[PDB]
């Protein structure tokens, strides 16, 4: 049943098994899918930065042809000349990656599965067990009533909340969330980091939120990612400038919104 | 093939088989899913009232992990502290229930399956056969050009129309409708009851419609449900008061709408 | 795996095998699904005209119960009296058809599969191989900045572009497109014909576009379809009259739109 959902790449698996043999602690796995709420593209930016900047290769491939609804989110063909020249498969993969140090870690990403989340969670549990994963770490942005002119708040959640140095709510499920819940029920350590992203900047990239999340992750896992922190820092500068001019040049109501949210923020702590 | 879609709870099945042994007529099954048009939440109110008020337990469990698209309708996790504390599975179940008398009946409900309706209908046919179901009964609200100030009309439909004491249309299918159609083709008695709900109150609870449907059901099946009829009656009083003040305090056009629909209604019969 | 997705009708298959025995060239297959962009209903009109006008029968039936999301596009039941009298199955079928000559060809149509496009493409490849298909031909409308007062442009694409007597883009995939891409990778000849349909008439029937596409198809395949060309020609006359009166009687901005698009059109070639 759940094992039918994925297959192993021997190269990636050999390299993992050699990391496991040389370090008894085991590996961290980061995971994040594209398809649920992710205010400010906080998780999406991090996924992009990892896969674009760091050396990696596949270790397990999920069967996206069974898991991904193609009419709902239509993968891109490329047209060149006259004919189809290429196709972006909507892959869902566990990759072996190295940080700037050369330290190995795992990274599970692609489109959020549309279906069969219980079987998918159970598959991810077998992968976590087979690859000696010691900690699984999810991350995303949630839109909040907070100002862009104050630092990004975060909500760490899961069983390893202690790694990031009153509340009872119902949240629409996502595949990562159910994966996290099933992993914890099986005894595995989970953390998650949700960035608090200002509602009114939520539907573009908010690099400050990706940066603040990347530094909680890096602080919690011991992974070292200075090039990515730097690129995000740079984007955040450009983005704060753009946001300032928008508010400054807009509506009275929008100005009054930011000041009203600043006041709420400063009055709390 | 269709048997893979569900499994039996032995406790619930034993209790059913003992009901079957003591009454040769067999049982009635009510069924209603969440996911198609149900003006006034007519079916939804009845589902809620049954499952909340009457003693019941599972007899068959469908494989919701195969049948329910999780990204389209995302089941709720609960967050408590710091971490996921619980999860509302999107279950699809045939339950044994007793009315206020202690008379047994079956109740099939949960999210409307998104996929595989032919295999699902055929599974429900095997369940209906194995559990000695004598009558299957669906129920929902359809939005109509009728006034809230006149009684709820109903359209009984199916092979047992006689149980509720000119027309040729194409209707978007729903899982219950295709189940009803396949059951009838296999010789099984089906009724359905559609409440006529005023368009302009259709997108909230319209307890009058649930009440009028509950009393056709109860009259057609011999089931006795006075506590539920009472709670619905009470809600309907509150709801008629709210609607009256809305129309009375709104637009000229809305007042003119209700009077125009009253006139149409009174001129017919 | 892919063979589970369809079954053969022996009658249709015998008649195909006899066509194959009498003509070594093999057959052409046209295919077009309902569910992706098709400006002006260009492909839809052709599908309708073929299936309504020409003698045909099933050769292969796909398992729509696995491939078609029923809640997303709900097949029609028919209500008559009092009860369900009929049901429009959302079939996906390869049909044997004859043109006005009696020349055989194949026609694959129904709702675009929602899921499992890789397995579906591979199934269509086995069907193309088993039925001696020499050319597979897709066709649809794309909305463009062009005037309704100038002829319909077309973009032929695929490996047999030569049959219809600078450009590098990413296009959302559709099932036909991925089928075309997999077929070409397996050595099979594909053509496609996309009609350029004026944006502002795109969301109804634009018979001129179906006609222009039908004549490229007919010219590329050697099929003869004069009755269908005639009906489309007739609709196009009615449609050009309706569009002229709309523009003529509308906004200054809409008049200025058509003239601005005419100017762009005439300045190119
Ligand atoms: Mg969907
Ligand atoms: Mg599916």
Numbering used by the authors:
A (entry chain A), B (entry chain A), C (entry chain A): 3 to 167, 173 to 276
Paper text:
The crystal structure of full length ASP1 was determined using Seleno-methionine (SeMet) derivatized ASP1 and single anomalous diffraction (SAD) techniques. The final model was refined with native data (2.2 Ǻ) to R and Rfree values of 17.4% and 23.4%, respectively. Crystals grew in space group I23 and contained a single copy of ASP1 in the asymmetric unit. As well, when analyzed by size exclusion chromatography, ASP1 eluted with a Stokes radius consistent with a molecular mass equivalent to ~125 kDa (monomer 36 kDa), further supporting the idea that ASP1 exists as a trimer in solution. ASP1 contains a single domain comprised of a central mixed β-sheet (β1–3-6-7-2-8-10-9) flanked by 4 α-helices on one side and 3 on the other yielding an overall three layered αβα fold. Trimer formation is largely stabilized by interactions between an extended anti-parallel hairpin (β4–5) and the αD region from an adjacent monomer. The first Mg2+ ion is positioned just above a negative ring of amino acids formed by three copies of D71 and D116. Structural and phylogenetic analysis indicates that although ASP1 retains a similar overall fold compared to members of the hydrolase superfamily such as purine nucleoside phosphorylase, the active site region and therefore function of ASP1 are distinct.
Among these actinobacteria-specific proteins, five proteins (corresponding to ML1009, ML1306, ML1029, ML0257 and ML0642 from the genome of Mycobacterium leprae TN) were found in every sequenced actinobacterial species including those from the deepest branch Rubrobacter xylanophilus and also from intracellular pathogens such as Tropheryma whipplei which have highly reduced genomes. All five of these proteins are conserved within actinobacteria but have no known function. These five actinobacteria-specific proteins are referred to in this work as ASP-1, 2, 3, 4 and 5. We report here the crystal structure of SCO1997 from S. coelicolor, which corresponds to the protein ML1009 from M. leprae (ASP1).
